[PDB]
Amino acid sequence: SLYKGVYELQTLELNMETLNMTMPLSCTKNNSHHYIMVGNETGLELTLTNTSIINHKFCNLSDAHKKNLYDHALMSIISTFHLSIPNFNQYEAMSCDFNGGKISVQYNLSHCGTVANGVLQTFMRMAWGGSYIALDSGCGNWDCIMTSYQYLIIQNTTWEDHCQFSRPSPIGYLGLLSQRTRDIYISRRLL
Amino acid sequence: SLYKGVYELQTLELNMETLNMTMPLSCTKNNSHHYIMVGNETGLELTLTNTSIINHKFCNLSDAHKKNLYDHALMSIISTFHLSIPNFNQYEAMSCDFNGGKISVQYNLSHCGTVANGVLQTFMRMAWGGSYIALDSGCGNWDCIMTSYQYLIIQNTTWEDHCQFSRPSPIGYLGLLSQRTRDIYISRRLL
Amino acid sequence: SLYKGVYELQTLELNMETLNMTMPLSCTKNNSHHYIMVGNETGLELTLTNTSIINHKFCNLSDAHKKNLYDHALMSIISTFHLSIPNFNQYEAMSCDFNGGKISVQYNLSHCGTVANGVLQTFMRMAWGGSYIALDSGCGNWDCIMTSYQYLIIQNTTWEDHCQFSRPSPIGYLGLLSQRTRDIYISRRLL
Amino acid sequence: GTFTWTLSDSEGKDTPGGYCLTRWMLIEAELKCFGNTAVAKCNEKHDEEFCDMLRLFDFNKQAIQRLKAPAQMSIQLINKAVNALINDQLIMKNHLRDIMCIPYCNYSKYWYLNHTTTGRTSLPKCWLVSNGSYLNETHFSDDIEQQADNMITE
Amino acid sequence: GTFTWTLSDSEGKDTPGGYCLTRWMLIEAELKCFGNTAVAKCNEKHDEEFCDMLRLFDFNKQAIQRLKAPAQMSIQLINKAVNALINDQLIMKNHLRDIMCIPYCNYSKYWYLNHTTTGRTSLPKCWLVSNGSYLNETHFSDDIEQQADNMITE
Amino acid sequence: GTFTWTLSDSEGKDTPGGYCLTRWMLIEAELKCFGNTAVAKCNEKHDEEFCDMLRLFDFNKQAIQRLKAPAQMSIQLINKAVNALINDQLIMKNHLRDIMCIPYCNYSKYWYLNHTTTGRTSLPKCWLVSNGSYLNETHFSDDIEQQADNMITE
Ligand SMILES: *[C@@H]1O[C@H](CO)[C@@H](O[C@@H]2O[C@H](CO)[C@@H](O[C@@H]3O[C@H](CO[C@H]4O[C@H](CO)[C@@H](O)[C@H](O)[C@@H]4O)[C@@H](O)[C@H](O[C@H]4O[C@H](CO)[C@@H](O)[C@H](O)[C@@H]4O[C@H]4O[C@H](CO)[C@@H](O)[C@H](O)[C@@H]4O)[C@@H]3O)[C@H](O)[C@H]2NC(C)=O)[C@H](O)[C@H]1NC(C)=O
Ligand SMILES: *[C@@H]1O[C@H](CO)[C@@H](O[C@@H]2O[C@H](CO)[C@@H](O[C@@H]3O[C@H](CO)[C@@H](O)[C@H](O[C@H]4O[C@H](CO)[C@@H](O)[C@H](O)[C@@H]4O[C@H]4O[C@H](CO)[C@@H](O)[C@H](O)[C@@H]4O)[C@@H]3O)[C@H](O)[C@H]2NC(C)=O)[C@H](O)[C@H]1NC(C)=O
Ligand SMILES: *[C@@H]1O[C@H](CO)[C@@H](O[C@@H]2O[C@H](CO)[C@@H](O[C@@H]3O[C@H](CO)[C@@H](O)[C@H](O[C@H]4O[C@H](CO)[C@@H](O)[C@H](O)[C@@H]4O)[C@@H]3O)[C@H](O)[C@H]2NC(C)=O)[C@H](O)[C@H]1NC(C)=O
Ligand SMILES: *[C@@H]1O[C@H](CO[C@@H]2O[C@@H](C)[C@@H](O)[C@@H](O)[C@@H]2O)[C@@H](O[C@@H]2O[C@H](CO)[C@@H](O[C@@H]3O[C@H](CO)[C@@H](O)[C@H](O)[C@@H]3O)[C@H](O)[C@H]2NC(C)=O)[C@H](O)[C@H]1NC(C)=O
Ligand SMILES: *[C@@H]1O[C@H](CO)[C@@H](O[C@@H]2O[C@H](CO)[C@@H](O[C@@H]3O[C@H](CO)[C@@H](O)[C@H](O)[C@@H]3O)[C@H](O)[C@H]2NC(C)=O)[C@H](O)[C@H]1NC(C)=O
Ligand SMILES: *[C@@H]1O[C@H](CO)[C@@H](O[C@@H]2O[C@H](CO)[C@@H](O[C@@H]3O[C@H](CO)[C@@H](O)[C@H](O)[C@@H]3O)[C@H](O)[C@H]2NC(C)=O)[C@H](O)[C@H]1NC(C)=O
Ligand SMILES: *[C@@H]1O[C@H](CO)[C@@H](O[C@@H]2O[C@H](CO)[C@@H](O[C@@H]3O[C@H](CO)[C@@H](O)[C@H](O)[C@@H]3O)[C@H](O)[C@H]2NC(C)=O)[C@H](O)[C@H]1NC(C)=O
Ligand SMILES: *[C@@H]1O[C@H](CO)[C@@H](O[C@@H]2O[C@H](CO)[C@@H](O)[C@H](O)[C@H]2NC(C)=O)[C@H](O)[C@H]1NC(C)=O
Ligand SMILES: *[C@@H]1O[C@H](CO)[C@@H](O[C@@H]2O[C@H](CO)[C@@H](O)[C@H](O)[C@H]2NC(C)=O)[C@H](O)[C@H]1NC(C)=O
Ligand SMILES: *[C@@H]1O[C@H](CO)[C@@H](O[C@@H]2O[C@H](CO)[C@@H](O)[C@H](O)[C@H]2NC(C)=O)[C@H](O)[C@H]1NC(C)=O
Ligand SMILES: *[C@@H]1O[C@H](CO)[C@@H](O[C@@H]2O[C@H](CO)[C@@H](O)[C@H](O)[C@H]2NC(C)=O)[C@H](O)[C@H]1NC(C)=O
Ligand SMILES: *[C@@H]1O[C@H](CO)[C@@H](O[C@@H]2O[C@H](CO)[C@@H](O)[C@H](O)[C@H]2NC(C)=O)[C@H](O)[C@H]1NC(C)=O
Ligand SMILES: *[C@@H]1O[C@H](CO)[C@@H](O[C@@H]2O[C@H](CO)[C@@H](O)[C@H](O)[C@H]2NC(C)=O)[C@H](O)[C@H]1NC(C)=O
Ligand SMILES: *[C@@H]1O[C@H](CO)[C@@H](O[C@@H]2O[C@H](CO)[C@@H](O)[C@H](O)[C@H]2NC(C)=O)[C@H](O)[C@H]1NC(C)=O
Ligand SMILES: *[C@@H]1O[C@H](CO)[C@@H](O[C@@H]2O[C@H](CO)[C@@H](O)[C@H](O)[C@H]2NC(C)=O)[C@H](O)[C@H]1NC(C)=O
Ligand SMILES: *[C@@H]1O[C@H](CO)[C@@H](O[C@@H]2O[C@H](CO)[C@@H](O)[C@H](O)[C@H]2NC(C)=O)[C@H](O)[C@H]1NC(C)=O
Ligand SMILES: *[C@@H]1O[C@H](CO)[C@@H](O)[C@H](O)[C@H]1NC(C)=O
Ligand SMILES: *[C@@H]1O[C@H](CO)[C@@H](O)[C@H](O)[C@H]1NC(C)=O
């Protein structure tokens, strides 16, 4: 339009794909598949499914750290994810498998105020654009956010065009960087 | 009071009780008893006392997390309190008892730069309004605080009007949210 | 040097020795020896060297905390240093010996994405005043920050007129306070 | 970071701005409305306790209005949002002033000037305390005078 | 703390200031430049998503130009300087508005006024979104009118 | 989120504001006083290293003056107060400028324009370094011209 006779309304749309070489870019393909791309070769696929891939309660983080073999950026993202979960107290909910250097994590999401809510809050914040469709309501419900899916599976993946619902954006990860270790519980006298 | 002929000095006082449904509100009953009300139903009672109630040196936070009977808001407040203690290095000072979802923490507090000083330093910030009376010196000392009382006991309690000396205020709790994990010592090489 | 006729350019320079009573002060003697002076009596000696002092792979932090024979200021600085290391995942790389209350930490620095990188970045931000001379390249290289020395040794020491090369400054330590626990991996499901 | 929460008001008022503390947000139990000019300072000022409390009260109102209440009371929302609502280092300043024996603000009491005829008011500034006693007005009368000059400047 | 990273795009222009988004920084658009008068507001204002995005893009440019790349990508640098570049509590505000069913900025689309003859433009403000649907221009037409009045005032 | 510490050095002066750095606070220099108009900028500016150092020095003075020192020195006080005294992200800016081989401030040396007759001074800006070499005065002469224009405007 034309406001005050001389001023025309004009618009931008930032291409945040160009931030890929410095930043993680998070975005959504469909309601059950979301991605965090780190560069043009690596990323994490977050997936809400009823199909579990880990049938054990182990999560051998110390052995993985001792062996290395993993991408440090992806492990940093996983650490930011886990430390941003509010009120995590059921360790058996989270299992994982870092054998061979890969990254595979599984949060067991099986009426609110529970660990599934804490996992889902950090999930939707991590992928801010396009996570509302994954939720049952998508709005108006925070303390009892919930999805019908039973497992959140985070797996390392290679780069491909995945943002068919939302554009790539670092805003969710950059927001959650301040959330790390902010709403965790003490498990020891000496942390 | 009329200033410059036309401007009248007026005052207002904020009723912070209305903030109870969104955040904790802390207030003082007397020298020993302080309270952190959560909602209109729950809260913590912080008593400076000569008498112990736990009498052992176990704090099974992990089993309490497994059972998951406690109140999550109260446990988060306990975590915020403990992680705000600077230079805590004596696990024997803190004893706990979380039977059946109970919360019952005890700090042993038995001349500068000791665990009693750090615990009291965080205690004057958890309940900021009106906790100065608990100390022998209201002000001028920060690194060498003492109390004649020998134990700080934090226990879950029901709601009741305890705000006899100071009004409800979230300012202490909201202030200490940034204090968390800021003066804690390392206990592991991989935290 | 007059500007616009009547405005004379003049110069100021701050003396940050006087801040010693309230905060640490970091500064450099030569390319290998760097210092963090807390007061006028105690401080830390950060030495890049090829001579190892600790032959074992222990850092008995818990025993040191229980005995409580150390300077709380110096152990606080050590905790700030270690928690600021980005992506520390080799517990064997760091050894300590706190027997008798002393402090003697040894980081084994023996490319991008390594323990030496994280230790050296935190070393630079801790000794930001004049530590740039400790590298092969002064600037233009951050991820692959490599120094020819094999060990970084942090030992408690007394006060002397140490830093010839750079002036005392709290800016490095004060900068690293916000970096604590900011980029650190998770070693266990409950922190 | 820095505070960013914007105060949602101005429905039914004569100007598009300002903020009104209702009968529930005040010990005196009387409505108090502040105009656009005073409340607009809260967008920029970093050392006003009243603005931080005003943002907290507005966020409490919006949170009870727009978010579903859980069955059990939870405080995750304020735990994440506090840095967006308030300057915690202002609380740190007030705590520091307290430990050093300097008069400080405990966020209870505030004072403002009010023009007798027009009803225009300044942004409320906090009434400081020292060891459980509110400062007498004479302890900061010149500050009040300075505020009057600002009201005469606008 | 507060954002501090400064935008350096002064060379080869008629005024030492402003900033230019290249065709790579924009979706389906060419080089578009903003003057010193608009970009200088970014040094002071704490609630502009576009200024945060400008700092992010400028830091990306300077980081690729002035730092040796690693063999494999690492995100240590952004984890180290995000608070220097942006206001994370602005992101917190937008998330709070998202969960409250208020329109919010997803940092994608922005709008500005542009004088037809002189070419002077305002600072781009964010086009708010709600449940995947961008707000029409009619939803915030009074904001556009106020921006035009501000442009005529200066 | 933002610094809040206020400088109180008003006693025994010709104006209620300003701040004076004593001989012990400076290296081989006598006592230097800065007026209200220059020091008052520190309340608003977020990218001024000298203002951060003024807050640090004032806090050091007040701490050693009002708080009883321990027998063995503590560090908890600065570890709390630093976010209220300084912008740590300004330090982060300077460190970022250091690693990318841009000139940066190491918080040591500062420059200001002093009016010869009246004695009015600018807010000191930091003298940047690069690899240990201070920039010559010619490297930022246009900044000095801009500052001179700024105080001619005042
Ligand atoms: C920010 O950036 C600037 C520029 O990069 C940087 O400035 C440099 O600061 C350092 C540290 O102060 C300066 O180093 C000092 O330089 C003087 C002069 O050196 C020349 O002249 C002496 C004459 O004796 C020669 O010996 C020397 O070789 C040079 O030719 C030295 O005198 C200083 O040494 C004394 O002080 C040191 C620290 O106190 C002592 O460790 C040293 O032993 C010396 O002390 C002796 O003399 C004292 C005299 O007062 C006496 O009191 C002592 O008891 C003892 O006898 C020191 O080397 C360097 O020159 C500065 N460079 C510039 C360009 O200004 C800042 O360091 C940096 N700041 C921060 C915070 O990062
Ligand atoms: C900031 O600083 C100021 C100044 O130092 C503090 O102001 C003081 O605050 C205290 C606490 O509110 C106040 O003491 C009250 O005085 C009242 C009059 O004597 C008392 O009635 C009141 O006790 C009653 O209220 C309590 C809380 O409701 C109850 O626990 C108690 O049982 C009493 O109950 C009576 O009153 C309630 C209503 O309040 C009623 O429902 C009951 O039925 C019953 O009638 C307190 O003793 C001081 O008078 C204040 N002093 C000044 C100068 O203002 C302020 O608290 C500080 N604020 C913070 C947040 O730190
Ligand atoms: C912020 O909000 C807006 C509105 O809610 C949102 O805009 C949407 O972005 C998505 C993601 O790009 C758009 O989806 C595209 O739609 C076109 C339709 O023609 C498709 O062709 C696109 O698919 C192609 O490109 C994809 C990505 O490269 C490929 O994966 C795909 O296979 C195709 O090649 C894509 O689906 C959507 O149309 C817009 N909607 C609007 C109203 O603009 C934006 O995502 C949000 N931004 C952020 C950063 O959150
Ligand atoms: C917290 O409490 C648990 C046990 O919980 C207690 O007993 C349960 C049956 C329930 O009734 C609970 O309500 C009750 O509190 C402690 O678990 C113990 O952990 C230790 C190791 O820290 C175990 O010792 C090990 O045992 C294995 C073999 O099982 C050996 O191979 C190891 O070498 C080592 O000896 C101990 O067996 C285990 N006990 C139980 C009952 O599980 C837990 O230590 C305790 N934590 C704290 C902080 O107090
Ligand atoms: C990740 O980000 C980088 C940008 O940081 C993207 O690479 C950039 O791609 C653009 C083209 O889309 C390059 O611009 C043009 O390059 C051509 C030559 O190929 C040149 O003739 C044009 O004048 C213009 O410069 C840009 O230079 C390039 N930059 C870098 C740093 O590589 C990359 O495409 C992005 N990858 C992903 C997976 O998103
Ligand atoms: C959301 O998007 C993802 C990815 O586009 C969808 O998952 C994909 O589903 C298809 C069809 O089931 C899979 O194709 C199949 O792959 C197997 C193994 O390669 C092959 O043997 C089959 O013949 C077929 O090609 C595809 O691999 C799979 N990809 C991923 C990433 O899982 C998902 O179904 C979509 N969900 C929704 C809700 O739309
Ligand atoms: C993720 O969590 C869910 C919920 O805890 C797990 O499913 C649960 O698995 C247990 C153990 O098998 C089930 O209890 C079982 O009940 C049957 C009788 O119904 C009994 O025969 C078994 O011996 C056992 O007691 C529980 O009912 C079941 N609940 C649900 C919702 O499925 C699931 O196994 C977990 N997944 C992973 C990967 O850890
Ligand atoms: C997830 O990461 C793993 C480990 O890096 C990838 O598997 C590796 O792929 C490379 C490709 O050159 C092989 O050389 C390695 O031997 C593989 N490792 C193992 C343990 O099999 C895996 O491809 C990644 N996942 C996806 C979906 O891309
Ligand atoms: C907690 O705060 C709530 C919300 O402000 C208070 O509930 C209000 O109480 C007044 C007085 O009884 C009622 O008129 C309002 O309608 C209530 N508002 C709502 C939204 O329910 C409540 O009184 C406070 N509780 C306590 C124990 O102080
Ligand atoms: C502060 O008030 C509490 C609550 O009234 C006092 O604790 C009570 O003390 C009486 C003394 O006869 C006991 O009978 C009650 O059982 C106590 N109640 C609780 C809940 O512990 C306490 O003594 C007061 N403290 C001071 C210093 O006056
Ligand atoms: C709190 O700590 C004090 C100090 O350690 C304990 O008192 C000590 O108890 C031991 C064991 O009985 C005695 O040998 C010491 O002589 C006591 N010391 C002092 C100074 O009295 C006290 O028992 C602890 N309280 C609890 C409940 O564990
Ligand atoms: C019980 O609490 C009292 C205060 O009510 C403690 O205070 C001591 O009081 C005696 C009186 O003779 C003084 O000599 C001590 O110096 C006081 N102690 C302190 C630490 O200041 C008293 O210690 C407690 N009694 C016990 C644990 O038996
Ligand atoms: C502290 O919490 C415990 C556990 O929730 C409370 O005890 C419970 O009280 C409820 C009623 O409020 C009963 O239905 C439960 O059966 C109790 N649980 C157990 C395990 O006994 C306890 O009352 C709280 N303490 C105080 C002082 O209020
Ligand atoms: C640490 O800082 C203190 C406080 O500024 C310095 O003490 C000053 O020392 C000078 C030189 O001797 C005296 O003129 C001042 O009066 C002292 N001030 C005070 C408050 O005591 C001290 O010099 C500094 N320490 C070191 C080792 O430089
Ligand atoms: C520091 O790390 C280096 C590198 O791993 C260690 O040196 C190795 O020592 C083992 C001992 O079995 C030798 O087999 C390797 O060949 C050595 N490698 C190199 C590159 O020299 C060294 O022992 C470690 N130092 C300490 C004090 O723990
Ligand atoms: C590092 O600290 C240790 C421990 O404080 C110092 O050694 C102590 O020195 C004091 C001097 O008064 C003696 O009383 C202690 O007995 C010593 N302890 C031990 C375990 O030897 C040591 O001197 C400090 N190091 C340096 C280089 O100053
Ligand atoms: C505070 O006031 C009380 C009287 O209510 C007095 O006994 C006490 O000494 C005062 N403390 C200080 C710090 O002045
Ligand atoms: C800094 O100066 C030294 C000589 O004093 C030089 O060797 C070094 O190369 C310079 N810095 C860089 C990064 O080139």
Helix and strand composition category of chain D: alpha+beta
Count, helices of chain D: 5
Strand content of chain A: 15-25%
SSE string of chain A: EEEEEHHEEHEH
Q: What's the order of the H and E elements of chain D? A: EEHHHHEEEEH
Main sheet summary of chain A: 6 strands, antiparallel
Shape of chain A: globular
User: In percent, how helical is the residue content of chain A?
Assistant: 10-25%
Please report the distance between the alpha carbons of the first and last residues of chain D: 31 Å
Q: Please indicate the percent range of residues of chain D in DSSP E strands (runs of 2 or more).
A: 5-15%
Radius of gyration of chain D: 17 Å
Oligomer: 6 chains of a larger assembly
Counted beta strands of chain A: 8
Identify the strand order in the major beta sheet of chain D. 1-2
Structural class of chain A: alpha+beta
Instruction: Give helix % range of chain D.
Output: 25-40%
The overall number of domains of chain A is: 1
Main sheet attributes: strand count, strand direction, barrel closure of chain D: 2 strands, antiparallel
Strand order of the largest sheet of chain A: 3-4-5-8-7-6
Rounded to the nearest angstrom, the radius of gyration of chain A is 18 Å
Number of domains of chain D: 1
